[PDB]
With several copies, the nearest count.
Chain A
Amino acid sequence: DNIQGITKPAIRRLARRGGVKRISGLIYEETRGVLKVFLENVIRDAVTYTEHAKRKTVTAMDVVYALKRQGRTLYGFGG
């Protein structure tokens, strides 16, 4: 599964940026699950805007309007 492409050291680096000094070995499967649930919710919205435009290509603006609807505004991608 492609979720396993979110490798352990990558999750550790995110935790290091998050200021985490010591990481239990169970955190990795938790973080994959949380990320997968997060992406599913945002992509569902972005696909909705894409289908409402009857487009086949999901655009960056479809994602920004998803993230803003999710209450999670992102600056820098033209929205």
Chain B
Amino acid sequence: KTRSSRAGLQFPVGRVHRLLRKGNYAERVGAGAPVYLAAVLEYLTAEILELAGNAARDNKKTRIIPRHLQLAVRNDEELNKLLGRVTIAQGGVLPNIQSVLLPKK
């Protein structure tokens, strides 16, 4: 029935279409535009959540928390490049000590 079920998507094609219209991004929005964009947003959502789920498992947690989103983003090459100008609340930083600082003896 609904366009998301036609596209095979979880993300809301109809709402993406509404936002494309009301954002004034163009005088008109083609019928394939929200289907394609919803599929891209769903993919990127799945890509982060896949990695964050693994980061959660590595911390024995069952619930993803911002720590795991920061770990998922910053450990992944393309996602770190996509989110290079993004700061994540409560994310922290990657564990990283410059090798010259370690107590070589």
Given a CB threshold of 8 Å, the question of whether A touches B is answered with yes
Which residue numbers of A lie inside 8 Å of B, CB to CB? 17-19, 21, 71-77
When A17-B93, A19-B96 are in contact, do A75 and B101 touch as well, CB less than 8 Å? no
Chain B contact residues (Cβ within 8 angstroms of A): what range? 10 to 19
| Complex CA–CA separation, A71 to B97 (angstroms) | 28
Map CB proximity to A onto B56-96 as digits: 1 under 8 Å, 0 otherwise. 00000000001000000000000000000111111011001
Is A75 within 8 A of B98, CB to CB? no
Tell me the dominant secondary structure on chain A's binding face: loop
Is B98 within 8 A of A19, CB to CB? yes
Tell me the dominant secondary structure on chain B's binding face: loop
Which residue numbers of B lie inside 8 Å of A, CB to CB? 66, 85-90, 92-93, 96-98, 101
| Complex CA–CA separation, A77 to B85 (angstroms) | 16
Q: CB-CB < 8 A to B66: which residues of A?
A: 76
Is B101 within 8 A of A73, CB to CB? no
Is B96 within 8 A of A71, CB to CB? no
Minimum CB distance partner of B93 in chain A: A17
B78 → chain A closest CB, angstroms: 14
B98 → chain A closest CB, angstroms: 6
Give the 4 A-B residue pairs with the shortest CB-CB distance, closest first: A76-B89, A21-B101, A73-B86, A74-B87
